[PDB]
């Protein structure tokens, strides 16, 4: 059937009876009233059974051996569905396929019923998910820590061409994967004040909110390791949230509990944008406070909570603990770790600081200013008074370090301050992270260089040793074997299965680049993939596309820096050329643009309306026929990504050079047989570098060119004046060609494009359509297109998260990865 | 061990491995980290497994045979713990006891970990629970319908002698008994307006709240019948509760969902008191609207949703459906049933009315005016506009009936109106229920007579056939076999086990009233019970009592009509007499008073403070010694009741004649070997009537005497003037003898007692202490005390809820009870 594992005789039988056990005993249903959803759960519960045994021994293992623990703190974990992924990592896919088949059910149909764990916005969230899978696969004692939002990223609906947001009630029918652990609930404080008494400061008169943990298993790839993702839920105490007496109402008191529990209710839908709302800050301290107590408790036990030197010496803390800050979101971990060590454990400042710096590491994910976290002091002052005091003290000592290093450099002092003066004082969270971490890394080579050269230049001059780079990657399991079994099978037929946990072995595919059978096969799976997606489209969304055309897709969050607008300009150009010479042949294309716009991002939502507007015109022009289709992919999410990417021919990664930190979608397309048209931005550079620029479609300004233009000054009118095709499009938008009933509908876009384009869309227009002509030319030659594809696939190995994690492990965490199978799952009951 | 069933060889082994399966696979724990709470859940899950098989066949059964369905609507279901009860009804108690013993665990210790399902306030709620158990035991196709509050009756805490209320988060660790059924969610409307168009009225522009059902199994006693209790939870739709666009905030929109979900958040803690809050009314319509849709859907299928006459003829609706209104709380079912039939199904008014009256039955539970539901018209007008219109139309037609029957009786017209004019117009829910139900019943013989003679006199004259009586009862299973296995065993040793489902057989115990061994045994279990409670007291609450004293207990909600105050006056009297003649012998007593006061009931909370105040003085007077102890039983609830009642010697049922509708606690004490000192109120009359007044301690005014006094006019000063002992107590309260630091602390009680005593406490004082002297005298003669006890126990059979239900079944529902074992639980998988 494929190498989705063995469909053993004893195990298919075993699976079937356990499916029935759960359908009866767990679901309390009988075959005569069971619906596909019930069947999905019976299976989910059956699959989940297979990894509890391993989950228990893994955790017990780490307790016995006591290795250095890795704590990945992130406010986002974009997990997606987990049934198939679990089958794949446990080698259960074929057995389950067989068993459910024998039970008369279609496994694929049941898999489609599982709701996505949308606890993320995009790249940052998904990176965390891929990292978790890799950390498990590399046998690291790692824990993912975050917030269990009851509402994930909103579900996008397109009404009249506009995006409509609606709550993602992903828990509505329950989550068979999580395990509530009420017994490990912890208290988290807010507000209050600071009392300075005799021997130390005291955080007093605080409001208490409780943190209830929920553990989700994270299985490694076929190694019997099952790590843990712990997600905190907010709960109100039953005392004060009722007991602070003297009139108000008993009923009201109980109803008001949903005020402390609002902390974990919803994920902020912002991607690469900072919103200084109090609720956000609370979510940030909430996950940090709760996680740290869990971390220290585990440390207090270790082998110190037995003997060792005997005296809670936190000197070995860094040797046993490593906490990775996914961006500045969990930044409060630094002043919180200090607070506990100093205020509660009573360590001297300097010893506590040494410990903190040595266990904390920070990862930066963007350089755009509006994405930077700068919290107003008055907010921290009211909500976390002691933390503010600690931050000021950290600042005081840090700046003294700077003054001593750069005597008389008074401007450098204000520039490096964690505290920013002005309208309202703010705290630069990024500066805090750098000062309190022993390592700061970027997510792509150019991004990392930019940090050193620009944004964090002064910090780099101060401590050059802190700055590193760790190019992002993606997990080959979900992003290849799971979403594209067809491609994975033909690759395995030639080079084996060892590449799934060793993606570098894909290079061996280079020697089949002239193999006639392979070229035919690679081309076949892509055709099968395109047909399946073309079908899904009519199935779930309804209104035809042509599977023979080039599948031009751009899927990612909607941003001005991602330049979906530049993609739009090209689409309109193609249209206009066709209307000019109707009877001239052009390579057919289906351009699919999908992504979600943050609710408050007006421009982004305007762009979505533009895309649908172009489709309205283009898709109903008889002269165009089937040569050009414009489709907006609704509710783009992880599960949707697993469907489009394997069916894509052209991947669009056209951000303005220097704005996309790394990107990961680009890698997903490269490993799945799509060719990349993009700019020398983020990881695109390392991808072209790995496959060879000849096998990549690079165009536009480099970072240097962008800066040259800024010195000069960017004037869009110039481009409007010298390019008639560009002029024609802008005047089409301005006159209502794309919005008849509302002719001025797109005035904001035009206005912006001409007067305040921060991402110089016009500047890359000419080189973009010229480059698009080159991909069309190559698509006309199926054999050469497929051969270039094989060059990309065979050369994508570097982009696996196993590589990225192995580097974090060695160069930042100080631990050694291991591909050693944990001693089976085998029963056992001590 | 007792007749808690057989501890079979094959089943104890089977139990043990399933306990281990759940501890591993369900709880995801290993013996080395498992806590008593984990062990409790493993067992709970193991026990729950045994009744799903039966649950499924019972429900399937009713679907095949299609008998008349009984729907018990109540806003309260006081269930208590359900682990032991389930073991008892499935004959699993000994097997589980053995198995857990072999696993090295104490079952009793694990049972104490289960949280109480406190979805009730007291009597009314508990009656519903006992009814459910009886309906299952009598094989009725019955369904309990209510609200799944996430916070039940508050947990009472005594701080400085004052009651402190704190949220009852009973779901904190989960509920292994319920089964969420998201797939059967239903929509419920609120607000909106009424449009009168061409062919009918339309309820329009309504706010939608969703009702998610949760089913809990209700097993019959050893008959393999497992009925269903369906509890609705409120959920916000994800559309409008987000989709009603045009600024407000996306985050805020999601946070505001907890506004529609507040409907099922908390139970109103009022007992025998009406609070016209909007949230209450919403909870009332919510449970009614959701339940009715479920009822009609089931009816639409039946055997009509196949063939029959073919044409949705609701003429057979009454023949297939019966809905019992537990008080006036679910009264809106009447106008709602009309609304659906008329507005949606399009039946003519008269046909719809005939159907409604024929399927609805109402049960009254109190005659005190402040407990009567009278909803302001402006509230119904805004929240349920169409229902108001229907109620007015019902009223219009009903009054026309009256006018025709009593021509010219204009005062009778206004008196009988469902609409009450005055300050603000109100709707008398009780009048609505009578008009729209074919049967109205009281809960005790005298209570029922009072309804006919007083409160509903005019309605009785109009339709005398509607009025009936159904004396309350309690379930012998939980209230005897479960809480008192020792007594149940010795009874079984003599007369067998058939009395558990046939309590009348207890009469056969009369012939052992002179049996020397039996007297010794009955006396022994009561002593063992008293020792166990005396131990629990020091265990969980701490500060000694004497097990040799008479256990004088009064446990029920705190009310002025229950007269805990009268009990207080007696306690103080005993104290004063002892202080007068210290060296005179008196029968030792431990008087225990427990109960909860509604948060807003100032007097009730003042009484609790008085009780603790008396204990402070009395319990620390050296001259008193161990002859008199005053103890306030904290957090009185079902699980606490299962502990005190079996250890009681004297049961206090001293309400003012004519105010306690029936009472059920009184019955619990009678079946458990306690003697009753009480008034000729509620069911006390039928109890004394059954055991013989010689075996009862009756005192005080009868209803007649109370009325005579009211004609005359009640003047408490008179009693104060003629009784020096009474005078002494009042002056002790007035001067601070019981409240040194705050001498005027009890001015409200004294003031009330002397000037506004609605329940004439002083009037029954003399006859009360005189009567108390008689019980002390008899307690001095152990052999005669025990013989009178045997007379009560042997004569309590009439008070089983099986008898009550059998009467409802035959005289109101039109169904025949059956003690036929359902065809085993046996596997089966069609
Ligand atoms: O705030 C961000 N959202 C992202 O997706 C992001 N930063 O992080 C991702 C993971 O490092 C990057 O790939 C992406 O380029 C960057 O925009
Ligand atoms: O509102 C009420 N609360 C009660 O306990 C009550 N009415 O109903 C119970 C069950 O019918 C009665 O036993 C009780 O006497 C009555 O007060
Ligand atoms: C991989 C992924 C992303 C990141 O895409 P980029 O192109 O790096 O912005 C965003 N959303 C989803 C659903 C993803 O799978
Ligand atoms: C039986 C019961 C009641 C009713 O007691 P009465 O004496 O009828 O008021 C109230 N509370 C609990 C916990 C009960 O078990």
Taking CB atoms within 8 Å and a gap of at least 24, the contacts of A376-380 are A376/A276, A376/A424, A376/A425, A376/A426, A377/A419, A377/A424, A377/A425, A377/A426, A377/A427, A378/A424, A378/A425, A379/A276, A379/A278, A379/A281, A380/A281, A380/A427
* Phi, psi angle pair for B557, to nearest 5°: -60, 150
Extended strands (E) in B167-313: 179-180, 186-190, 193-196, 201-204, 207-219, 226-235
Residue B163: its H or E element: strand B162-166
Owner of token pair 């080395």:
B32
- Residue B639, helix vs strand vs coil: helix
Owner of token pair 């003066």:
A421
Residue A751 CA to residue A747 CA, distance in Å, equals: 6
Residue A20 CA to residue B830 CA, distance in Å, equals: 11
Give me ligand 2 centre to Cα A247, in Å: 29
* Phi, psi angle pair for B761, to nearest 5°: -65, -45
Other CB atoms within 10 A of residue B256 CB: 14
B718: alpha, beta or left? (left if phi > 0; alpha if psi -120 to 50)? alpha
Residue B570 CA to residue B726 CA, distance in Å, equals: 9
Instruction: Select from A651, A666, A653, A683 the least CA-distant residue to A764.
Output: A653
Say if residue B580 is exposed, middle or buried (CB neighbours under 10 Å; 0-12, 13-18, 19+).
exposed
* Pair type for strands A675-678 and A650-653: parallel
On whether the CB atoms of residues A440 and A456 are closer than 8 A, the answer is yes
Alpha helices in B104-178 (DSSP H): 107-111, 123-137
* Phi, psi angle pair for B418, to nearest 5°: -80, -20
Hey, which residues does A134 pair with through a beta bridge?
none
- Cβ–ligand 3 distance for A126 under 6 Å, the answer yes
> What residues of B are designated binding site for AMP?
30, 63, 297-306
A210: alpha, beta or left? (left if phi > 0; alpha if psi -120 to 50)? beta
Instruction: Select from A147, A295, A156 the least CA-distant residue to A212.
Output: A147
On whether the CB atoms of residues B589 and B552 are closer than 8 A, the answer is yes
- After which residues does chain A have a break in its backbone, defined as C to next N over 2.5 Å? none
Say if residue A322 is exposed, middle or buried (CB neighbours under 10 Å; 0-12, 13-18, 19+).
buried
Q: Which residues of B are identified as catalytic?
A: 365, 556-557, 562, 664, 668
Q: What is the largest CA-CA distance in chain B?
A: 90
B31, B269, B829 member nearest A830 (Cβ): B31
Residue A529: its H or E element: helix A516-536
Q: Looking at ligand 1, which atom is closest to the CA of residue A682? A: 15
Instruction: Select from A200, A470, A428 the least CA-distant residue to A326.
Output: A470
On whether the CB atoms of residues B286 and B261 are closer than 8 A, the answer is no
On whether the CB atoms of residues A614 and A568 are closer than 8 A, the answer is yes
Mutate to test the interface with B, among A31, A250, A281, A602 (most CBs of B within 10 A): A250
Residue B264 CA to residue B257 CA, distance in Å, equals: 13
Residue A822 gets which letter from DSSP?
Answer: P
Residue B119 CA to residue A798 CA, distance in Å, equals: 60
B568-B571-B577 Cα angle (round to 5)? 140
* Pair type for strands B207-219 and B186-190: antiparallel
Listing DSSP states for B430-498 in one string gives HHHHHHH-S-EEESSHHHHHHHHHTTTHHHHHH-TTTEEE----B-HIIIIIIT-HHHHHHHHHHH-SG
**Residues near B809 by beta carbon (within 8 Å), at least 6 away in sequence:** B70, B138, B140, B815, B816, B817
Mutate to test the interface with A, among B38, B55, B228, B251 (most CBs of A within 10 A): B251
- For residue B498, give Cα distances in angstroms to A591, A789, B270, B691: 78, 82, 39, 21
Other CB atoms within 10 A of residue A419 CB: 18
Say if residue A671 is exposed, middle or buried (CB neighbours under 10 Å; 0-12, 13-18, 19+).
buried
Contacts of A172 in chain B (CB under 8 A): 182, 235
* Phi, psi angle pair for A737, to nearest 5°: -60, -35
The per-residue b/e assignment along B501-535, b for 16 or more CB within 10 angstroms, e otherwise, is bbbebbbebeebbeeeebbebbbebbeebbeebbe
Two tokens at B307?
Answer: 């063939």
Instruction: Select from B158, B299, B148 the least CA-distant residue to B235.
Output: B148
DSSP H helix total and E strand total for chain B: 33, 25
Residue A548 CA to residue A627 CA, distance in Å, equals: 10
A770 is in an annotated binding site: no
Listing DSSP states for B36-98 in one string gives HHHHHHHHHHHHHHHHHHHHHHHHHHHHHH-PPEEEEE-S-EEEE--HHHHHHHTT-HHHHHH
Instruction: Select from A726, A550, A730 the least CA-distant residue to A652.
Output: A550
Contact A35 B183 (CB under 8 A): yes
On whether the CB atoms of residues B758 and B710 are closer than 8 A, the answer is no
A20, A258, A829 member nearest B24 (Cβ): A829
Extended strands (E) in B547-646: 550-555, 589-594, 628-633
* Pair type for strands B117-119 and B77-80: antiparallel
Instruction: Select from A70, A77, A139, A67 the least CA-distant residue to A323.
Output: A70
**Residues near B645 by beta carbon (within 8 Å), at least 6 away in sequence:** B479, B483, B555, B665, B668, B669, B672, B674
Contacts of B154 in chain A (CB under 8 A): 250
Owner of token pair 């079912």:
B333
Residue A351 CA to residue B362 CA, distance in Å, equals: 75
Other CB atoms within 10 A of residue B264 CB: 25
On whether the CB atoms of residues B474 and B130 are closer than 8 A, the answer is yes
Residue A74 CA to residue A128 CA, distance in Å, equals: 7
Secondary structure, 3-state, A45-105: HHHHHHHHHHHHHHHHHHHHHCCCEEEEECCCEEEECCHHHHHHHCCCHHHHHHHHHHCCC
Other CB atoms within 10 A of residue A702 CB: 16
The answer to whether residue A520 is catalytic is no
The per-residue b/e assignment along B651-678, b for 16 or more CB within 10 angstroms, e otherwise, is bbbbbbbbbbbbbbbbbbbbbbbbbbbb
* Phi, psi angle pair for B12, to nearest 5°: -70, -35
Gap between the terminal Cα atoms of chain A: 39
Mutate to test the interface with B, among A28, A255, A602 (most CBs of B within 10 A): A28
Residue A213 CA to residue A190 CA, distance in Å, equals: 19
Secondary structure, 3-state, B22-42: HHHHHCCCCCCCCCHHHHHHH
Hey, which residues does A550 pair with through a beta bridge?
A589
Gap between the terminal Cα atoms of chain B: 39
On whether the CB atoms of residues B108 and B57 are closer than 8 A, the answer is no
Dihedral sign computed on CA atoms, order A657, A662, A667, A669: negative
Give me ligand 2 centre to Cα B323, in Å: 20
Residue B761 CA to residue B753 CA, distance in Å, equals: 7
**Residues near B488 by beta carbon (within 8 Å), at least 6 away in sequence:** B2, B3, B480, B481, B500
Residue A466 CA to residue A362 CA, distance in Å, equals: 10
> How many residues are given for chain B?
830
DSSP H helix total and E strand total for chain A: 33, 25
> What residues of B are designated binding site?
30, 63, 297-306
* Phi, psi angle pair for A455, to nearest 5°: -40, -50
Half-sphere exposure of B581 (CA within 13 A, CB side): 6
The catalytic position among A668, A760, A791, A798 is: A668
Owner of token pair 């594209």:
A484
Residue A142 CA to residue A818 CA, distance in Å, equals: 13
- Residue B551, helix vs strand vs coil: strand
- Residue A514, helix vs strand vs coil: coil
On whether the CB atoms of residues A830 and B31 are closer than 8 A, the answer is yes
A672: Cα separation from own chain's centroid: 19
Q: Looking at ligand 4, which atom is closest to the CA of residue B641? A: 15
- For residue B56, give Cα distances in angstroms to A44, B62, B142, B145: 22, 10, 15, 19
The answer to whether residue A664 is catalytic is yes
- Residue A551, helix vs strand vs coil: strand
Two tokens at B537?
Answer: 């007291």
Residue A661 CA to residue A442 CA, distance in Å, equals: 8
- Residue B211, helix vs strand vs coil: strand
Q: Please compute Rg for chain A using Cα positions.
A: 28
* Pair type for strands B186-190 and A675-678: unpaired
Two tokens at A359?
Answer: 């266990």
On whether the CB atoms of residues B418 and B389 are closer than 8 A, the answer is no
Owner of token pair 């929240």:
B383
**Residues near A105 by beta carbon (within 8 Å), at least 6 away in sequence:** A39
Other CB atoms within 10 A of residue A345 CB: 14
- For residue B278, give Cα distances in angstroms to A102, A553, B149, B378, B382: 55, 53, 16, 11, 10
A70-A74-A80 Cα angle (round to 5)? 105
Hey, which residues does B214 pair with through a beta bridge?
B180, B231
Residue A703: its H or E element: helix A703-712
* Pair type for strands A207-219 and A179-180: antiparallel
On whether the CB atoms of residues A177 and A82 are closer than 8 A, the answer is yes
On whether the CB atoms of residues B24 and A829 are closer than 8 A, the answer is yes
* Pair type for strands A628-633 and A589-594: parallel
Residue B679 gets which letter from DSSP?
Answer: -
In 3-state terms, chain B is what percent helix, strand and coil (to 5)?
A: 50, 15, 35
In order of start, what are the domains of chain B with their CATH numbers?
1-473+801-824 (3.40.50.2000), 474-800 (3.40.50.2000)
Owner of token pair 């890698």:
A667
Q: Which protein residues touch ligand 2 with a CB less than 6 Å away?
A: B 122-124, 127, 271-272, 365-366, 371, 443, 472, 660-664, 682
Hey, which residues does A190 pair with through a beta bridge?
A207
Secondary structure, 3-state, B253-277: HHHCCCCCCHHHCECCCCCCCCCCC
> How many residues are given for chain A?
830
Secondary structure, 3-state, B761-826: CHHHHHHHHHHHHHHHHHHCCHHHHHHHHHHHHCCCHHHEHHHHHHHHHHHHHCCCCCCCCCCCCC
Dihedral sign computed on CA atoms, order B449, B454, B456, B457: positive
- For residue A550, give Cα distances in angstroms to A588, A595, A675, A768, B174: 6, 20, 11, 17, 53
Contacts of A164 in chain B (CB under 8 A): 243, 245
Alpha helices in A138-267 (DSSP H): 240-243, 250-255
Give me ligand 1 centre to Cα A553, in Å: 19
- Experimental approach: X-ray
Instruction: Select from A79, A121, A122, A73 the least CA-distant residue to A666.
Output: A122
On whether the CB atoms of residues A155 and A640 are closer than 8 A, the answer is no
Alpha helices in B302-348 (DSSP H): 317-320, 333-339
B167, B254, B830 member nearest A266 (Cβ): B254
B333-B336-B337 Cα angle (round to 5)? 80
Owner of token pair 């629990």:
B536
Listing DSSP states for A603-632 in one string gives HHHHHHHHHHHHHHHHTT-TTTTTSEEEEE
- After which residues does chain B have a break in its backbone, defined as C to next N over 2.5 Å? none
Residue A570 CA to residue B42 CA, distance in Å, equals: 63
Residue A407 CA to residue B32 CA, distance in Å, equals: 60
**Residues near A276 by beta carbon (within 8 Å), at least 6 away in sequence:** A374, A375, A376, A379
Residue B223 gets which letter from DSSP?
Answer: S
Alpha helices in A222-302 (DSSP H): 240-243, 250-255, 278-301
Q: Looking at ligand 1, which atom is closest to the CA of residue A327? A: 1
The catalytic position among A664, A786, A795, A804 is: A664
On whether the CB atoms of residues B509 and B790 are closer than 8 A, the answer is yes
């Amino acid at each position: 059937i494929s190498v989705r594992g063995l469909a053993g005789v004893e195990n298919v039988t075993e699976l079937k009876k356990n499916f029935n056990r759960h359908l009866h005993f767990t679901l309390v249903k009988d075959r005569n009233v069971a619906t596909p959803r019930d069947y999905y759960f019976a299976l989910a519960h059956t699959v989940r059974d297979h990894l509890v045994g391993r989950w228990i021994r893994t955790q017990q293992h780490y307790y016995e051996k006591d290795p250095k623990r890795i704590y990945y703190l992130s406010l986002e974990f974009y997990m997606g569905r987990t049934l198939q992924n679990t089958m794949v990592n446990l080698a259960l896919e074929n057995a389950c396929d067989e068993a459910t088949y024998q039970l008369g059910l279609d496994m694929e149909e049941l898999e489609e019923i599982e709701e996505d764990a949308g606890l993320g916005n995009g790249g940052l969230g998904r990176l965390a998910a891929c990292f978790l899978d890799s950390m498990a696969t590399l046998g690291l004692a790692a824990y993912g820590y975050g917030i269990r939002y009851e509402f994930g990223i909103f579900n996008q609906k397109i009404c009249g061409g506009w995006q409509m947001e609606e709550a993602d009630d992903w828990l509505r029918y329950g989550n068979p994967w999580e395990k509530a652990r009420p017994e490990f609930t912890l208290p988290v404080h807010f507000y209050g004040r600071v009392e300075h008494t005799s021997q130390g400061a005291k955080w007093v008169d605080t409001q208490v909110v409780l943190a209830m943990p929920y553990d989700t298993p994270v299985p490694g790839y076929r190694n019997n390791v099952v790590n843990t993702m712990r997600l905190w839920s907010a709960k109100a105490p039953n005392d004060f949230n009722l007991k602070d007496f003297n009139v108000g109402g008993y009923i009201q008191a109980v109803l008001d509990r949903n005020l402390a529990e609002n902390i974990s209710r919803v994920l902020y839908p912002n991607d690469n944008f900072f919103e200084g709302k109090e609720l956000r800050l609370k979510q940030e301290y909430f996950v940090v406070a709760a996680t740290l107590q869990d971390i220290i408790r585990r440390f207090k036990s270790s082998k110190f909570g037995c003997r060792d030197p005997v005296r809670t010496n936190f000197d070995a803390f860094p040797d046993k603990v490593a906490i990775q800050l996914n961006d500045t979101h969990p930044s409060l971990a630094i002043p919180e770790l200090m607070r506990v060590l100093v205020d509660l454990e009573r360590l001297d400042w300097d010893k506590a600081w040494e410990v903190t710096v040595k266990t904390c590491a920070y990862t930066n994910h963007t350089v755009i200013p509006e994405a930077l976290e700068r919290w107003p002091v008055h907010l921290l002052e009211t909500l976390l008074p002691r933390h503010l005091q600690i931050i000021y003290e950290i600042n005081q000592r840090f700046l003294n370090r700077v003054a001593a290093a750069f005597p008389g450099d008074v401007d450098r002092l204000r520039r490096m301050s964690l505290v920013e003066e002005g309208a309202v004082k703010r705290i630069n969270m990024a500066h805090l992270c750098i000062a309190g971490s022993h390592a700061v890394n970027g997510v792509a080579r150019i991004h990392s260089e930019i940090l050193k050269k620009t944004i964090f230049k002064d910090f780099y001059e101060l401590e050059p040793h802190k700055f590193q780079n760790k190019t992002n990657g993606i997990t080959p399991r979900r992003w290849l074997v799971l979403c594209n079994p067809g491609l994975a099978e033909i690759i395995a037929e030639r080079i084996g299965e060892e590449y799934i946990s060793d993606l570098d072995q894909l290079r061996k595919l280079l020697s089949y680049v002239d193999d006639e059978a392979f070229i035919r096969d690679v081309a076949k799976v892509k055709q099968e993939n395109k047909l399946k997606f073309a079908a899904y489209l009519e199935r779930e969304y309804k209104v035809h596309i042509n599977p023979n055309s080039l599948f031009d897709v751009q899927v990612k969050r909607i941003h001005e820096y991602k330049r979906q607008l530049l993609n739009c300009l090209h689409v309109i150009t193609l249209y206009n050329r066709i209307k000019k010479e109707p009877n001239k042949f052009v390579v057919p294309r289906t351009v699919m643009i999908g992504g979600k716009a943050a609710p408050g991002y007006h421009m982004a939502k305007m762009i979505i309306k533009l895309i649908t507007a172009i489709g309205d015109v283009v898709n109903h022009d008889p002269v165009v026929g089937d040569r050009l289709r414009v489709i907006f992919l609704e509710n783009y999410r992880v599960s949707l990504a697993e469907k489009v990417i394997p069916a894509a021919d052209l991947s669009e990664q056209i951000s303005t050079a220097g704005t996309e930190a790394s990107g990961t979608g680009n890698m997903k397309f490269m490993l799945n047989g799509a060719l990349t048209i993009g700019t020398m931005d983020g990881a695109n550079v390392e991808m072209a570098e790995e496959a060879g620029e000849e096998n990549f479609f690079i165009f536009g300004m480099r970072v240097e060119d962008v800066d040259r233009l800024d010195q000069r000054g960017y004037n869009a009118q110039e481009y409007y004046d010298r390019i008639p095709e560009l002029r024609q499009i802008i005047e089409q938008l301005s006159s209502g060609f794309f919005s008849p009933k509302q002719p001025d509908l797109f005035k904001d876009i035009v206005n912006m494009l001409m007067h305040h384009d921060r991402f110089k869309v016009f500047a890359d227009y000419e080189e973009y359509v010229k480059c698009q002509e080159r991909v069309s030319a190559l698509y006309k030659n199926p054999r050469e297109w497929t051969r270039m594809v094989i060059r990309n696939i065979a050369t994508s190995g570097k982009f696996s998260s196993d590589r990225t994690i192995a580097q974090y492990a060695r160069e930042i965490w100080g631990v050694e990865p291991s591909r050693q199978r944990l001693p089976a799952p085998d029963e056992k009951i001590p």
